[PDB]
Amino acid sequence: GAPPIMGSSVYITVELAIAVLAILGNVLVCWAVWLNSNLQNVTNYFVVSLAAADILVGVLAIPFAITISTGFCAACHGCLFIACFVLVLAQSSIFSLLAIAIDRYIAIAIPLRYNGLVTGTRAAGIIAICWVLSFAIGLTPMLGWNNCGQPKEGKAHSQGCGEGQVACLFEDVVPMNYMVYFNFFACVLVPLLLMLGVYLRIFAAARRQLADLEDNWETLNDNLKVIEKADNAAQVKDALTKMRAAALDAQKPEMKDFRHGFDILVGQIDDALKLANEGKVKEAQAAAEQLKTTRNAYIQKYLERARSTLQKEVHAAKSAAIIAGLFALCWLPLHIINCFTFFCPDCSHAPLWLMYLAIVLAHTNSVVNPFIYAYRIREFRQTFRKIIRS
Numbered sequence: 085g086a087p088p089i090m091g092s093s094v095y096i097t098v099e100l101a102i103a104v105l106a107i108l109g110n111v112l113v114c115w116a117v118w119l120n121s122n123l124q125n126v127t128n129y130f131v132v133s134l135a136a137a138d139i140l141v142g143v144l145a146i147p148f149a150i151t152i153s154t155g156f157c158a159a160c161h162g163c164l165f166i167a168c169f170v171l172v173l174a175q176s177s178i179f180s181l182l183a184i185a186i187d188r189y190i191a192i193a194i195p196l197r198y199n200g201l202v203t204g205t206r207a208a209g210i211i212a213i214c215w216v217l218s219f220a221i222g223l224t225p226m227l228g229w230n231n232c233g234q235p236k237e238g239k240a241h242s243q244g245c246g247e248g249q250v251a252c253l254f255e256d257v258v259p260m261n262y263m264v265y266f267n268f269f270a271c272v273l274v275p276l277l278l279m280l281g282v283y284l285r286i287f288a289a290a291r292r293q294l295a296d297l298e299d300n301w302e303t304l305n306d307n308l309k310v311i312e313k314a315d316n317a318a319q320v321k322d323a324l325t326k327m328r329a330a331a332l333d334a335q336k337p338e339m340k341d342f343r344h345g346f347d348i349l350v351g352q353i354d355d356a357l358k359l360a361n362e363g364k365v366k367e368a369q370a371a372a373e374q375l376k377t378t379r380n381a382y383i384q385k386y387l388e389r390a391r392s393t394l395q396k397e398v399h400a401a402k403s404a405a406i407i408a409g410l411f412a413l414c415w416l417p418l419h420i421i422n423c424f425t426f427f428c429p430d431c432s433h434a435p436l437w438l439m440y441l442a443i444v445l446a447h448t449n450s451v452v453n454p455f456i457y458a459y460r461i462r463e464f465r466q467t468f469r470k471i472i473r474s
C-alpha cells in the first residue's frame with residue numbers, strides 16, 4: 085500500500101494544471117467577445133455562458149474536487165455542496181450547448197424571422213433562467229436526496245471525525261440512483277440526444293436548401309433549351325410559365341443588385357410570354373435569349389452567394405457540434421462508470437486510478453473549447469491573435 089500522498093500529489097498537480105489552462109483559455113474567449121463587435125451576437129452569448137461555466141470549473145470545481153479527494157471530516161451538508169457544485173456547472177454547460185444548437189437551427193430554418201425572434205435581450209433571460217435551473221438540478225441532493233441520513237459511522241470514527249461529521253467522499257454522500265437516473269439519464273443523456281436530433285435537422289435543412297438552389301438553377305437552364313428548340317408558340321409559353329413561377333419562387337447594396345436582377349428576369353420572362361401569347365414564336369425565342377444576359381450578370385451571383393452562405397452555416401454548425409460531441413466524450417466515461425457501480429453490485433468497483441482518470445478527463449473538457457474556436461472560427465482566431473499581441 086503506497087503512501088496515499090504520492091498518488092494524491094500526481095492527481096492534484098494534474099488538476100491544478102487543468103485549472104490554470106481552463107481559466108486562461110476561457111478568459112480569452114470572454115475577452116474576445118467583449119472586445120470585438122463582430123463576435124457580439126446571440127450565439128456567442130451562449131458561448132460566453134459556456135466559457136463562464138468552464139472558468140468556474142477552474143476556480144471552484146477543481147479546488148472542490150481536490151478537497152473531496154482527501155476524505156476530510158466535514159458536516160455532511162457542507163460536503164454535499166462541494167461534491168455537487170460541479171454538477172451545477174455541467175448542467176449549465178448542457179443548457180448552453182442545447183441553446184447553441186437551437187439557435188443555429190432557427191438561423192438555417194427561418195433566416196427571415198431569425199433576427200426578430202432571437203434577440204440579445206431574450207438570450208440573456210434564457211441564460212439567467214438556465215443558470216437558476218442548473219443550480220436546482222445540480223444541488224437537488226441538498227434538498228434531501230442524499231446519504232446524510234445514513235452516515236458511514238465506522239469510517240467517520242476511524243478518521244477521528246467529530247459528531248455530526250462524515251468523511252467527505254463523493255460516493256458516500258451523493259446517492260448513485262440520483263447520479264444515474266436523475267443526473268445522467270434525465271439531465272445529461274436526454275439533452276445530448278436532443279442536441280443530436282437538432283444537429284441532424286440542421287444538416288438535413290442545409291442539404292435540402294442547397295439541393296433546391298441547384299434545382300431552380302437547372303430548371304432555369306433546361307427551360308431555356310426547351311424554348312430554343314420549341315417549334316410553336318404554345319411550347320415556348322409553357323416553358324416560360326414555369327420559369328416565371330420558379331423565378332418568383334427564388335425571389336423569396338448586394339440586396340439592391342439582386343432585387344434588380346430578379347426584377348429584370350421576371351420582366352424579361354413577361355416580355356417573352358406576351359410575344360408567345362401573340363403567336364410570335366421567333367420573337368418570343370429571341371426575347372427569351374435575353375434572359376441569358378440577366379442569368380450571367382445577376383442570377384449566377386445570387387446562386388453563388390446563397391450557396392456560400394449555406395456552406396458557412398454548415399461549417400459553423402459542425403464547429404458547434406464538435407464542441408457538443410467533445411463534452412459528451414469527456415463526461416461519458418465517468419457517467420458510464422457510475423452506471424457499472426450502480427447496476428452491477430456484483431462487479432468489483434472501478435479501481436481508484438480509473439476513477440481519478442475519468443474525473444480529470446471530465447475536467448479537461450473545460451480546456452478544449454477555446455482551441456476549437458481558435459482552429460475553426462477565423463473571427464475568434466484573429467481576435468485571439470490581436471489580444472495576445474497587444
Ligand SMILES: CC(C)CCC[C@@H](C)[C@H]1CC[C@H]2[C@@H]3CC=C4C[C@@H](O)CC[C@]4(C)[C@H]3CC[C@]12C
Nearest residue numbers: 144148157158159160161162163164165166249
Ligand atoms: C463566491 C466564492 C468565492 C465563495 C466560495 C465559498 C466556498 C469555498 C464555501 C461556501 C460553503 C463552504 C462550505 C460550508 C460548510 C462546510 C462544512 C465544514 O464542516 C467543512 C467546510 C465546508 C465544506 C465549507 C467549505 C467552503 C465552502 C464551500
Ligand SMILES: CC(C)CCC[C@@H](C)[C@H]1CC[C@H]2[C@@H]3CC=C4C[C@@H](O)CC[C@]4(C)[C@H]3CC[C@]12C
Nearest residue numbers: 412413416417418420421424431432433434435
Ligand atoms: C465514452 C467512450 C470513450 C467509452 C468509454 C468506456 C469506458 C468508460 C468503459 C469501457 C470498459 C469499461 C470497464 C469494463 C469492466 C469493468 C470492470 C467492473 O468490475 C467495473 C467497471 C469496469 C472497470 C468498466 C468501467 C467503464 C469502462 C472503462
Ligand SMILES: CC(C)CCC[C@@H](C)[C@H]1CC[C@H]2[C@@H]3CC=C4C[C@@H](O)CC[C@]4(C)[C@H]3CC[C@]12C
Nearest residue numbers: 273416419420421423424425426427428429431
Ligand atoms: C448513446 C450511448 C452513449 C448512451 C450511453 C449508454 C450507457 C447507458 C450504457 C453503455 C454500456 C452500458 C453498460 C454495459 C454493461 C453493464 C453491466 C450490467 O451488469 C449492468 C448494466 C451495465 C452497467 C450497462 C449500463 C448502461 C450502459 C453504461
Ligand SMILES: CC(C)CCC[C@@H](C)[C@H]1CC[C@H]2[C@@H]3CC=C4C[C@@H](O)CC[C@]4(C)[C@H]3CC[C@]12C
Nearest residue numbers: 086091094098435436437438440441442444445
Ligand atoms: C493521451 C494521454 C494523456 C492519456 C493518458 C492515459 C494515462 C494517463 C493512463 C492510461 C493507463 C493508466 C494507468 C493504468 C494502470 C495503472 C496501475 C495503477 O495501479 C496505478 C495507475 C496506473 C499507472 C494508470 C495511471 C493512468 C494511466 C497511465
Ligand SMILES: CCCCCCCC/C=C/CCCCCCCC(=O)OC[C@H](O)CO
Nearest residue numbers: 090091094098101102105437448451452455
Ligand atoms: C487540451 C489538452 C488537454 C489538457 C491536458 C492538461 C494536463 C494533463 C496532463 C497531465 C500529465 C501530468 C503528468 C502525469 C504523470 C503521471 C504518471 C504516473 O506515474 O502515475 C502514477 C500513478 O497514477 C500513481 O497511482
Ligand SMILES: CCCCCCCC/C=C\CCCCCCCC(=O)OC[C@H](O)CO
Nearest residue numbers: 161208209211212215216219220223226227
Ligand atoms: C442548503 C442550501 C440549499 C440550496 C439549494 C439551492 C437551489 C438553487 C436555486 C437557486 C440558486 C440561484 C443562483 C443564482 C444564478 C445566477 C444567474 C446569473 O447570474 O446569470 C447571469 C445572466 O446571464 C446575466 O445576463
Ligand SMILES: Nc1nc(NCCc2ccc(O)cc2)nc2nc(-c3ccco3)nn12
Nearest residue numbers: 170171253254255263418419422439440443
Ligand atoms: N463516482 C464519482 N466519484 C467521485 N469521487 C470519488 C471517487 C471514488 C470512488 C470510490 C471510492 O471508494 C473512493 C473514491 N467523483 C465523481 N464525480 C462524478 C460525476 C460528476 C458528474 C458525473 O459523475 N461521479 N463521481
Ligand SMILES: CCCCCCCC/C=C/CCCCCCCC(=O)O
Nearest residue numbers: 269273274277423426427428429430
Ligand atoms: C439511442 C439511445 C441511447 C441510449 C438511451 C437508452 C439508455 C438505456 C440504458 C439502460 C441501462 C439499464 C441497465 C439495467 C441493468 C439492470 C441490472 C440488474 O438488473 O441487475
Ligand SMILES: CCCCCCCC/C=C/CCCCCCCC(=O)O
Nearest residue numbers: 416420424426427428429430431432
Ligand atoms: C454502446 C453499447 C455497447 C454494449 C456493449 C456490450 C454490453 C453488453 C454486456 C453486458 C455485460 C453483462 C456482464 C454482467 C456480468 C456480471 C453478471 C452478474 O454476475 O450479475
Ligand SMILES: CCCCCCCC/C=C/CCCCCCCC(=O)O
Nearest residue numbers: 416417420424427428429430431432
Ligand atoms: C462496443 C464495445 C464492445 C466491447 C466488447 C463487448 C463484449 C463484452 C463482454 C462481456 C462479457 C462479460 C463476462 C462476465 C462473466 C462473469 C461470470 C459469471 O457471472 O458467472
Ligand SMILES: CCCCCCCC/C=C/CCCCCCCC(=O)O
Nearest residue numbers: 416420421424428429430431432433
Ligand atoms: C460506449 C459503451 C461502452 C461501455 C462498456 C462496454 C463494455 C461492457 C463490458 C462489461 C463487462 C463487465 C464485466 C463484469 C465483471 C465482473 C464479473 C462478475 O463478477 O460477475
Ligand SMILES: CCCCCCCC/C=C\CCCCCCCC(=O)O
Nearest residue numbers: 091092095098153437440441444445
Ligand atoms: C487526460 C488528461 C491527462 C490525464 C493524466 C492522468 C494522470 C493523473 C490522473 C490520475 C492518476 C491516478 C492517481 C490517483 C491517486 C488517487 C487519488 C487520491 O486518492 O488522492
Ligand SMILES: CCCCCCCC/C=C\CCCCCCCC(=O)O
Nearest residue numbers: 089092093094096097098100101104
Ligand atoms: C505557462 C505556465 C503557467 C503555470 C503552470 C503551472 C503548472 C503546475 C501547476 C500546479 C503544480 C502544483 C504542485 C503542488 C504539489 C502538491 C501535491 C501535494 O500537496 O501533495
Ligand SMILES: CCCCCCCC/C=C\CCCCCCCC(=O)O
Nearest residue numbers: 114115117118132135136137139140
Ligand atoms: C470577482 C467576483 C465575481 C466572480 C464571478 C465569476 C463568474 C465567471 C466569470 C466570468 C463570466 C462573465 C464574463 C462575461 C464577460 C463577457 C460578456 C460579453 O462577452 O458580452
Ligand SMILES: CCCCCCCC/C=C\CCCCCCCC(=O)O
Nearest residue numbers: 128129130132133136140208211215
Ligand atoms: C459559487 C459562486 C459563484 C457562482 C457563479 C454562478 C453564476 C454564473 C453567473 C453568470 C455567468 C454567466 C455569464 C453569461 C454572460 C452571457 C450574457 C450576455 O452575454 O448577454
Ligand SMILES: CCCCCCCC/C=C\CCCCCCCC(=O)O
Nearest residue numbers: 221261265266269270271272274275
Ligand atoms: C432537464 C432535461 C429534460 C429532462 C427530461 C426527462 C425525461 C425522463 C427521461 C429519462 C429518465 C430515466 C428514467 C429511468 C427510470 C428507472 C427508475 C427505476 O426503475 O428505479
